[model samples]
Target: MVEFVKICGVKTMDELRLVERYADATGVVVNSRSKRKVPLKTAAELIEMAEIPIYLVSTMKTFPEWANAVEKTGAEYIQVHSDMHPKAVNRLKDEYGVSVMKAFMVPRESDDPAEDAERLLELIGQYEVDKILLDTGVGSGRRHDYRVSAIIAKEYPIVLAGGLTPENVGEAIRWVKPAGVDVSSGVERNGVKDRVLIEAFMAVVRNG
Candidate 1:
């Protein structure tokens, strides 16, 4: 099946318009340290202006910070670091009524990828996470082991992110059949999202 496609790290209205045509949802980076960080006001503006779901992507922080983000930004989804406290994860949804997507790092250690996948699966289950995001590392543009993603996706609602482009996303879909796919540099040109890659990626995902 064609998975839910999302082009992430978009910063401007122009990029939003470009990706919205193909993506079911889009990501907005709010990690204070990253170059893609979207200020609260800007993120709010983007959230209000766009028609699709907005993922407020950020690193682990206190519950208050995460709470303020959803309240202020009005983002439909929250993708936070795996290290965030379990209490915070529960409150984000039960208290604020905001959906949370938990991201996990599938490390490249010994053993098959299935072991790594199972570890993350066990973690998210405890938090009762709304969704799972698998990545290699933050902003690394490197893919987490697909072999691992392929396994976890079969059992969970997984969103595969990191280093996906128009070409390889098809293979990822074929192998993992994730609930969704997220991209950043994969649909960009010189650090900015490009329409060509956006359209190309969409065609393969929404069609093939």
Candidate 2:
């Protein structure tokens, strides 16, 4: 299968249409805390307009509501943030039967990457959750250590995210070889989706 690319935190229909052409899956944020959070009505509109599969990503506090809403929206995947415990993830999967992608932060320079990977693997093993995403950073533009995320992906099916942009995404793919790649601010210009940058980002992922 081709490497999946998910352009997340999409809001406008035009942005959704532009990303759907190249992204295997598109993500919409449900976390009210996030600047990119879209209203439920807007989310529904975008989901209805989407031509491809869309994933609903939410923080731990809002996941239950988001999961329920996701079912209504017909999303294929739900990316959960750090607030969820592994056990909670298992329960959500069992109850909802929706594919879950657990998102974790990649350890920084001071942290132990091996230990982090082991803990992540343990969570997966304990929960039997199959999909995982290694987040290098949050909303900040700072790049996460690809080498660390690459190490984790080598051991399990994981998506690579954090500071991925058109300029450096190819290098990220070459190094990580992740099951999928996800980006949000990377395709934005002045906090809005930039069509040219979105196309460039997809080009790097597709052609690289």
Candidate 3:
């Protein structure tokens, strides 16, 4: 069953309010490479006004950067995509009591999906994060072979992301049965979130 639904790349209070009505959580990129990245002060204000939980999405390469963002925003949850040592992941949880969702980028191009899937499992086994976000890459907005996702989903309750849309999400959920689904570009048009797409995506997720 789909337990968690996240709408990512929110930049403004209006965007936050729009997503909060339907999504379990929302993402606010800060100190990251994503074009959606918001300033730390902007992120803090959004977090403070948010009703649903906020994920401070970052590509910070070190633990200190992560620590600084969390402290500045008072974010209780963060999503990291950079390569951090396993010990650093543990330290984040140990020190700040933040729920860390580490991104595991499934191979975008691979001859052996099975072998690639195994490699993902191995990488995740080294971390003690609270959640695993299975994705292709930052803003790839294109689906990878679910044969790889299938293998990982069987072992972990992953938050399936990348290239998901209102049309395909229902099928992806039924096929993968991931613990959560995350959408960014799927519910968007011209780089802005569209109400129709968001509503359609939520309808399928909630009903299907």
Candidate 4:
């Protein structure tokens, strides 16, 4: 199957439309520490306006944060950190019918990539998530050894993020073969989505 593509941190309707045309999903960051963070109102607007699936990326540190997020945006998909109690993550899905995507950060300092891969898989084994997103670190824009994620990809269909650009995405896909690719800063120009870059990204993900 062709790998799916998701454009993250989309803020405006114009950006939403561009993403809808080429990507399988769009991600809106709320309750985040990054510059891309959107307010609940804007997130709701984007979710309402989106034709593609919206992965509401959030820090959602507390239960109320989780509750408010689901209540406010009504997004079909919510991407969050794995640190949120597994029971609460389950509650978000069971009570609210929200599909959860748990984000896993690959360790920066690890002796063995193989051991790191095993550890990541072990942590993911605890969740009942709709999807798994593997990144170097959320909003870090630092790339990790794809080999670690590649090992996990063999175990589960994970979405690959962190330092992906139009230039390197093709090679990354070849290496990891993630279920999808998530891009935020990689496709941006001066911290905002760039049409030329996004178009280039789509072309590679689509054709290659």
Candidate order by lDDT, decreasing, is 3, 4, 1, 2
Candidate lDDT values, in order? 0.79, 0.74, 0.86, 0.84
Task: Write one digit per residue (lDDT tens) for candidate 2, span 18-51.
Answer: 7887787888887557988987777877877788
Worst 10 residues of 3 by lDDT: 136-145
lDDT of 3 at 68: 92
How does each model score on TM-score? 0.89, 0.83, 0.91, 0.92
Give the alpha carbon lDDT tens digit for every residue of 1-208 in model 3. 6899999999888888889888999999999778799999999999999998889998898999999998999999999888888899888988999998999778755767788788888988998888899884444323345767878999998999887899989988887788999999898878887888999998888897
Candidate with the larger TM-score of 2 and 3: 3
Where model 1 places Cα greater than 4 Å from the true spot, the runs are 137-144
TM-score of 4: 0.92
lDDT (10s digit) by residue, model 4, range 75-116: 888999648988889988888898888998887567567878
| Model 4 clashing residue pairs (backbone) | none
lDDT of 2: 0.74
Residue 44 of model 1 has an lDDT of: 87
lDDT of 1 by residue, 54-98 (tens): 888899478888878888888778888648877878878888787
The number of the candidate with the highest lDDT is 3
* Candidate numbers sorted by TM-score from highest down: 4, 3, 1, 2
Which residue pairs collide in model 3, if any? Answer: none
The stretch of ten residues in a row with the least summed lDDT in candidate 4 is 136-145
Q: Could you say which candidate leads in TM-score? A: 4
Please identify which of the two predictions, 1 or 2, would achieve the higher TM-score against the true structure.
1
Model 1 TM: 0.89
Clashes of each: 0, 0, 0, 0
